[model samples]
Target chain A: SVRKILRMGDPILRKISEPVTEDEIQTKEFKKLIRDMFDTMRHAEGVGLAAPQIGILKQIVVVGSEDNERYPGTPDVPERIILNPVITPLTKDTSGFWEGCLSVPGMRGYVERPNQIRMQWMDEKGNQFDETIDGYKAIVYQHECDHLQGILYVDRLKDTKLFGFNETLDSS
Target chain B: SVRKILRMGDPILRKISEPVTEDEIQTKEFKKLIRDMFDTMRHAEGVGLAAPQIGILKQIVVVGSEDNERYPGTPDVPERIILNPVITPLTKDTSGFWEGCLSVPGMRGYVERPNQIRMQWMDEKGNQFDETIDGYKAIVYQHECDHLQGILYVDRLKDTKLFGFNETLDSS
Candidate 1:
């Protein structure tokens, strides 16, 4: 049930995603969508996946990392499905990481983002939880949430010179 | 003979392009490529196009505008093919424009760039020229030349908040 993940420049990727409602989260279709998203993310070896990436304009995201090839050395994040997520920066401090996106493959861009954030989101069962996140996971959360707002990592590239093909960058 | 334009996420678009040699410019294949680039640009109603956009990893650009709908109210520029262009900013003054790209279509990002620049380039006939350009054409030239260095307008967005769908921005 892996969906076709839309790449950059597809107009659908630029459009804002709608907020998922509590009632809608209980439907069979919604559950199926979560499974499909995880399947697609797993198939692509992505650390995360957003609903909008597959042309679904809903504030839904799936994130996890377990020996992922795309992002080696990243700490493990227990698989989780987040719906209607909202984020707030908790510190002026920033983390600089060379981020690559599932939509923007084969290239990486260095981006600096606030290291600490307070995020509130709902689970598949419509259960809500608010938590403070930091470190690499925080970067992953911010990146995945940004997708809901129609933002891409390329737009936040710290410097053009710091971005290029992964192979070229690796050797340098 | 319109060639397929590489989109924003394609790894090929992120790689540095090779410079067009004087001898290579005299070849029939190079001339046909110019015509095809113009054909593709005209078909897309674009003001400019780069060789890398159509999968030619050469430092070549084609720029012209004649009643372009994508960029209405822009001044006309005579059709010309520039090879191996190098730009030097001439002014600290900046021009803020909502720039869009053929590769990154349907979205516009507000970018501020130097209003004037000095450029050196060779023509198809191996004639070298140096010129100081300003205004919209200057913007066009800078934008088109950026492709040779694997840069995109999105990377230069002044603010992420200022970027969105064309229809959304138009309505706002």
Candidate 2:
């Protein structure tokens, strides 16, 4: 289901995603988007991928925890196709850790984030559900959420001091 | 100069941060907000804190590295304060790492993020700047960037499987 790969300078990357209309959620295009996102995340070695990252500016994302040759610390979890996921009050607190992205290549940093969150979203079948998540899963959700808002991880940083890649695995 | 702390459930936390007008950027209120964010970040043992976390909801954040009694990591550089930041052109490549948050308490998890990022932002005096970052610092910026959009880290996760405190640290 993975379609074309989006590189830097793509206009879709800069556009804030539009919420999925009720009809779009149940269309074949949406399902294909979900499947393609899952395939893309797996092939790209990403834990999460959003529709906008692949040129579709819609409020959709595929989140999962898997470790391939690319990502060593991938968690064990099935892929989740979320549509219009809305984050609510989180139960866990915020903590800082290292992070990287596909859009901005060859960069990494120490980013602070919430440990747990509550969200409302729809499944691939268009069924609405509300759930609370913590730990690694929460982090994945947050990353995709940024895509929905047209924000990238680097925009969140305060300074450039902690910015560098593979200098030391233990640095973050 | 430290201001009052803004906890969860505060309405300001959910408001979209506004760009700092020319006058407000140099005001005592802005300076105090910066100082208080720095103090709160240090006191709370966080790498970065946004104005919204303290109820300001302005497009500003204070970040830096420290290895005080709370955080045992190596302090790379002094403190940095960013205002009105923007991120662009995210790469598809990504990596995952352990993370925690201050706003959402008592959780840590493995999250995926872009390996590289490009960021544009302003300084305390309203000077605009842009830079590309990688590694741990990139991750930190991404987390802080989410604050500008009223997004929390927990929103990035996939499921509750990895939820919990010290119990989930082993996965990373």
Candidate 3:
């Protein structure tokens, strides 16, 4: 099912979200939500999606590295479901990169982020694991982590003058 | 002196902020930066100001609860200058609340955040202190901390559907 796309004027988007209860994570509804999120992310050309982005106030997210029509330069990795992921910094190097978001359409900017990170999260089957990511993949993970915390990329930009968007047929 | 107001598109806002070196905190420039942050926060009617918000990409922030004509219902407290703040959870209760950002003007939404948090930060004199806060104050701290990490409040919203503006005279 194609989930409803939220527009720019809903109150639920601002509300702090609730953590997923253990029982809720094991339910059929949660499973369906995960599937729908994967479909929505792919259809919208996003690398990740959190439950709140779909109006569900739960600490759940889907991350994938599949490079399709939407994200051409991304690496191809198996789809993964993270339940209540927590991010921590294990290194000190930080760098800037250009990034765009599916939620904030038609705008891209250069943003600074840590070059590497260490994070712990649960897999689809509820197993816990820890991993460190670097480079582009690390950037993607940080972006997804922001979703869990209720933050957007536009909020990170210091000046609005750097924002730009132009439709081009050759660029995907 | 009026401090610079960081806008939504600024690249400095997205930079991974530099950790404040202990030596820098003892200098006159750092002191002025702290004072200017307070002045700017008051003029902008904000309860918090991170160093990055004023074009200084350092991990420092000034937060206070004071009532002014612009923010009528705010609490009154001594001004606080916090350096290298770290957030830790004190409870598991998740709550949803309304939030707006000075960086992203004319945008408001419901955001979910942790109910209680404990933070450790350096004082104005460069001594470290730790405190635990809950409710509104905790929310403010989290929002400011997000700035340090290049995360914005809008990112936390489920989607743009929750975005809105305060049109009523009393609300705005």
Candidate 4:
């Protein structure tokens, strides 16, 4: 079941999500939500989706990529579910990218994030894992995680002139 | 004449506003917009408002205060229309304050800002004036001006834990 992705301007998108309890993960409803998120992300051709994007204030994010048209040059991200994710920047060096969001459609903003990060998160089964993620994957992970904190890419834009509609920006 | 104020998470709030042309400010429609904005702000008991907050992408800000209950301790601010305003930080010293916005109602975030600034802007009559502003009025000006650049006070929250609902924070 592909859920309706809430667009920008909805107050729910600015809400900070709550952590998923371990007891709740074993429930059938939680499993169905994971499946629905994947379906919605795939249907929308999004690289990732957070529960907040669909109006749920849960700290759950789904990420994957298989020749995504939305971000043509990005590397493939194997499908993964991240729960209760926390990230630590491992480098002061920054990587700049023109990022877009599912909630803020048809617009792109140039944002720079730490190129390297150590991320700790749990899986659907509540198994915790920590890994060092860098490059485009780090960007994707950080982008998705920001949703849990009620943040959007537009908020991190270093220069407002670098942001505009996709068509206008591309033609420029 | 009270217009609906666009809330946070609205893509329009993340848009870079266009400068109000000198010719346009003299028109009846433009004057009416100023009046309507003041009406909306007064109705909402807001100390200030930006054009984008009302879904207009113009570099216009209206600020005034006459014993606002929403912000009880704030100093009185004379009504003024600011057009094409630009600000320059004049000091490294910061004043930390718990700030709230009309667009992000019912929440407060602690933010630190430069205490002194040199501001230049044109009035509704197209007269440009430059002044050195400090203290509470300076904070109000910066808060309202940020809406023009697609920035929000929530983005400046140094510590995420310092942000929360008014009732929850008030009780704590």
Candidate 5:
């Protein structure tokens, strides 16, 4: 059940996704979508996937992994699924990166995220967790959360020259 | 209608698009898609968009404009529509640049293409077109043509480190 990753300009991708209900999350169908998300994201060589990325306007997103070809040399972060996740920047210190997205392809834009964050959310299996994430992992966390809010990385691009086709970044 | 773009790994986006039929290219629907590609590309601040970007694997693409926020200081280019286009490299000498795709959002990678090309195609009204293109426009033609060939900018990435999300390219 690999899902299609919607790109920018799709109205559905811009909608603020709705939160999943506890009862709904327990359903087998909901569980399978999560499984499908993993398969789709991996097949796409993406480290993360949001329900909205697959055209579901639900507040659900899955993230992480190590040695991901899409982000080589990234820390080995195990996969994570969070529903209605929340984030609070730990400090004003911002770390920026040429962040890429499964939904937004081809161009990597310069986006800055707080170096640390306090995060809270629930797993697809109904477990709740709260934790503090630091370093570039903090950047990835912020990226996934932005999807639930109907946002794309371009929303945070500091400049346009910083944006372009991934193939032409080095051309003079 | 500005349709949602299809990201990489979507099977349809990877297909070598079918050539637009003469009868179909003359339809109101086909005309609208050309218009929509322009609108969507402009709204997303992109310099170009292909039919596959909008989830239609028809051999069609639109490109142009000046001061494009997504491209910046680009030589003014008149918007155009090309169906079942063919490109012939004008020279063996190649130029490289940071290229981005609306379909492959959030990532920009380096790609090298012949600085000039001879292009032939049909317009939305089924009119014929043949021309010689150069500079940034030539790079864009290559980018859009690659989509028709089931290729992404990453396919040409000489180094993975040089490929990433757009935001981090210049950061320390």
Candidate 6:
């Protein structure tokens, strides 16, 4: 099921789920959730998706990079499936990038964030990955963690000017 | 001429192109070149193409966006034919994005750049237009402008590790 993504102001988008257990990872329901998450995320043209965005409240997130219509010719981030991820700001240095979310469709926002971070996450099968990430990977990590923190990118948008539709901003 | 797109070793890629005038714009010769650039670029899943990429020494570049395989969900960046373009970095602030080129294939590179820029350019008729741009448009502007300067995105990469093949980077 490519489940319906919860939008801004939806109570479900604000709820944080408990950590997924190894036992849960072995189950059919949780596995299907991840599959459906990928399905819906790909359908929406997003670079990433999270479980809570789909109202599951689970600490699952997926980050992907492709030659997406929204993002063409970009270096790929390769896709990753994570469970109960943690992000540690690795630098006081900050950078900003435009980000869009499936739950918050049609509007793009610019949010300043730590430029580097250490991400710790587990695969659905329970293997752990811990690595220092920067640039786009760092951006994806922080964005998904924001979902886990009960926040949307709109919450982090300080100035209203950087928010816009894909059309108005194009040179066309 | 769906002209042969010269590879990286071609010395013509480094040669600065002469500016195009209204006379050149109206010529059947230049007109067909524009059409063929689009054909070749699209055939290769490119978002933009520059004349130098095809061994032409004209200050001409065309950019367009669509639902190509490499870039799936991007909004359309209407096709543009620009002769003699100027790019002004709009701020000290910056963001990073991935870029690929028609002249350079199979590799994508990460490059940090100004998030916004003032782009000024002309059509074959030599009419001037100027506008502020950000996000993907900004990336496209800088990328083609680099061709005019004999630089590739790889030249802009600070870390070589970020470069890779499109196949290896995709989830599928």
lDDT for each residue of candidate 5 in A1-172, tens digit (9 for 90 to 100): 7887776646566679898989999899898999999989889988788898898989898886767887766776688888989899888988778888886676566788889899999987788889999987788878888989878786776654355455545331
Give the worst 10-residue stretch by lDDT in candidate 6 chain B: B163-172
Which residue runs does candidate 2 get wrong by more than 4 Å?
A: A7-11, A68-70, A89-92, A167-172, B1-172
lDDT of 6 by residue, A1-172 (tens): 5788776546566667678999999999988988999988888877888898887888989878678777664567788898898999989888877777776655566788899999888997799999999987788789988888777786676443454444434421
Candidate 4: Cα lDDT at A135:
99
Question: For residues B71-121, could you state the per-residue lDDT of candidate 5 as single tens digits?
Answer: 655677688887898999989878878777786666666677899999898
Please give the ranking of all candidate structures by TM-score, highest first, separated by commas.
1, 4, 5, 3, 6, 2
Between candidates 2 and 3, name the one with more favorable DockQ. Answer: 3
Residue A99 lDDT (model 3): 69
TM-score between candidate 4 and the true structure: 0.55
In model 4, the runs with Cα more than 4 Å from the true position are A1-172
Candidate order (lDDT): 4, 1, 5, 6, 3, 2
Output the worst ten-in-a-row residue range by lDDT, candidate 4 chain A. A160-169
Model 3 lDDT tens row, A1-172: 6696443244444445666766777889888988899989888877777776788777787877566555566566557887777778667776676667665555565567788888788766778879987877677778766755667665565443444342321232
Give the CAPRI rating of model 2.
incorrect
Q: How much TM-score does chain B earn in each model? A: 0.98, 0.85, 0.89, 0.98, 0.92, 0.92
lDDT of each: 0.87, 0.69, 0.71, 0.88, 0.78, 0.76
lDDT by residue (tens digit), candidate 1, B1-172? 8887766756566678999888898889999999999999999888999999998889999998888888877899899989999999999999899898998767677899999999999988989989999999999999999898889887787875666557656756
Q: Each candidate: fraction of true contacts kept?
A: 0.04, 0.00, 0.22, 0.00, 0.00, 0.00
Query: If both were scored by TM-score, which would come out higher, candidate 4 or candidate 5?
Result: 4
For each candidate, give its TM-score against the true structure.
0.62, 0.47, 0.51, 0.55, 0.52, 0.49
lDDT (C-alpha) at residue A148 in model 1: 96
Q: Which 10-residue span in candidate 5 chain B carries the lowest summed lDDT?
A: B163-172
lDDT of 4 by residue, B36-154 (tens): 99999999999999999998999999999999888878899999999999999999988998899988777677889999999999999999999999999999999988989988887
